[PDB]
Amino acid sequence: ALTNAQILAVIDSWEETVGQFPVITHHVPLGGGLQGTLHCYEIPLAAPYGVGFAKNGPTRWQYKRTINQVVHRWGSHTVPFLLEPDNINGKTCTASALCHNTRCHNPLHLCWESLDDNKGRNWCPGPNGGCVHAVVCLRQGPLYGPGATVAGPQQRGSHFVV
Amino acid sequence: ALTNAQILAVIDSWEETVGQFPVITHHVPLGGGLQGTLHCYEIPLAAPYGVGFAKNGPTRWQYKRTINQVVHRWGSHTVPFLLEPDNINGKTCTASALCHNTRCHNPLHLCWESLDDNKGRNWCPGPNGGCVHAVVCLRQGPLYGPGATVAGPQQRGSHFVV
DNA sequence: TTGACTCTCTTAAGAGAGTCA
DNA sequence: TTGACTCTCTTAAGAGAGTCA
Ligand code: NA
Ligand code: NA
Ligand SMILES: [Zn+2]
Ligand SMILES: [Zn+2]
Ligand SMILES: [Zn+2]
Ligand SMILES: [Zn+2]
Numbered sequence: 001a002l003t004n005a006q007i008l009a010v011i012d013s014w015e016e017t018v019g020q021f022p023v024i025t026h027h028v029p030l031g032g033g034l035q036g037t038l039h040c041y042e043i044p045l046a047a048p049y050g051v052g053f054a055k056n057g058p059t060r061w062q063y064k065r066t067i068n069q070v071v072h073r074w075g076s077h078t079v080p081f082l083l084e085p086d087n088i089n090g091k092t093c094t095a096s097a098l099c100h101n102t103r104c105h106n107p108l109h110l111c112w113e114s115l116d117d118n119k120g121r122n123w124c125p126g127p128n129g130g131c132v133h134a135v136v137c138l139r140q141g142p143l144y145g146p147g148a149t150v151a152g153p154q155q156r157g158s159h160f161v162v
Numbered sequence: 163a164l165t166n167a168q169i170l171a172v173i174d175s176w177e178e179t180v181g182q183f184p185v186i187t188h189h190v191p192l193g194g195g196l197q198g199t200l201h202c203y204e205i206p207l208a209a210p211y212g213v214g215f216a217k218n219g220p221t222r223w224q225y226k227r228t229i230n231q232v233v234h235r236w237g238s239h240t241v242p243f244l245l246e247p248d249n250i251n252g253k254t255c256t257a258s259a260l261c262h263n264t265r266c267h268n269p270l271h272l273c274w275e276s277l278d279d280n281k282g283r284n285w286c287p288g289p290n291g292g293c294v295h296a297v298v299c300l301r302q303g304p305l306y307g308p309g310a311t312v313a314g315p316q317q318r319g320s321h322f323v324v
Numbered sequence: 325t326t327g328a329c330t331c332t333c334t335t336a337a338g339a340g341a342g343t344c345a
Numbered sequence: 346t347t348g349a350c351t352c353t354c355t356t357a358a359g360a361g362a363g364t365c366a
């Protein structure tokens with residue numbers, strides 16, 4: 001098994017490589033009618049992506065290192081959390097993009113939480129609009145708002161009460 | 163089936179059958195420290211379920227009627243909305259349960275919206291805690307709250323800024 | 325040891341369609 | 346015509362593992 005030192009070395013190699021990705025400045029809603037700025041470190045759209053990186057899906061990548069003749073591989077966003085517990089409350093931990101930008105690999109834009117917590121950030125009003133997440137959101141979620149509901153609750157007869 | 167009169171016939175027969183389901187009272191959080199009461203009309207746990215109804219999955223059912231000697235079938239929760247557009251902004255319309263109770267078929271607890279809008283109601287603060295859904299929620303979402311994040315954003319070196 | 329491809333799987337909100345009696 | 350079962354698929358947030366040179 002990899003030692004703590006080997007794991008830290010893996011995290012260091014990842015940061016050095018991701019830190020050289022193109023840095024894109026984005027203006028984003030924060031909630032409460034305010035605007036902020038996020039700086040995303042974005043993996044390239046096509047190969048080559050960077051030392052150790054390869055694409056396994058349309059917006060999925062993996063990071064690979066060979067140690068003592070053995071090949072090790074991790075999801076490209078999971079590396080910052082290799083020294084953390086990998087489950088909580090019986091649920092698997094997942095890399096959760098606070099910037100909602102799948103190509104970004106900035107570890108300051110990622111957290112480590114259940115898939116339900118991860119998903120729910122899509123609808124959060126944001127750090128200046130009422131976010132109650134203990135690890136606070138960086139921006140208002142892209143899907144927050146009144147929605148586009150086609151038809152509401154309704155009945156034709158009188159069989160039902162609310 | 164095809165004509166307006168036949169579709170109205172399907173909706174009326176469905177309302178009559180579901181109107182005989184057992185009515186179960188559920189007390190629910192509304193947000194803002196307040197509580198309300200909903201009356202769900204719950205499909206039985208095992209067969210028989212009711213005229214026209216059959217189970218295709220653990221929490222999935224279908225309604226079936228024979229019209230013009232042909233069998234027509236729909237998802238158990240879609241029948242109230244058979245006269246509505248079946249898409250919006252190029253996204254499929256889905257039956258969304260405002261009471262978050264899958265066995266419930268009370269049409270006063272259903273709406274018709276994209277799968278993203280549907281999912282997002284799981285994290286809404288509720289009608290007394292700040293819901294902004296244009297078709298308003300009936301309760302606070304079951305997954306609303308601070309979350310259980312294991313690790314927050316972090317870096318080991320000095321290569322990244324927020 | 326490394327790059328650039330290939331394939332299938334998980335979750336929880338939702339679906340369509342076939343086999344028998 | 347009606348009832349009671351069987352199977353796989355969709356979406357968008359996430360994953361693991363094989364092949365070849
Ligand atoms: Na996310
Ligand atoms: Na729902
Ligand atoms: Zn980012
Ligand atoms: Zn938040
Ligand atoms: Zn209900
Ligand atoms: Zn709401």
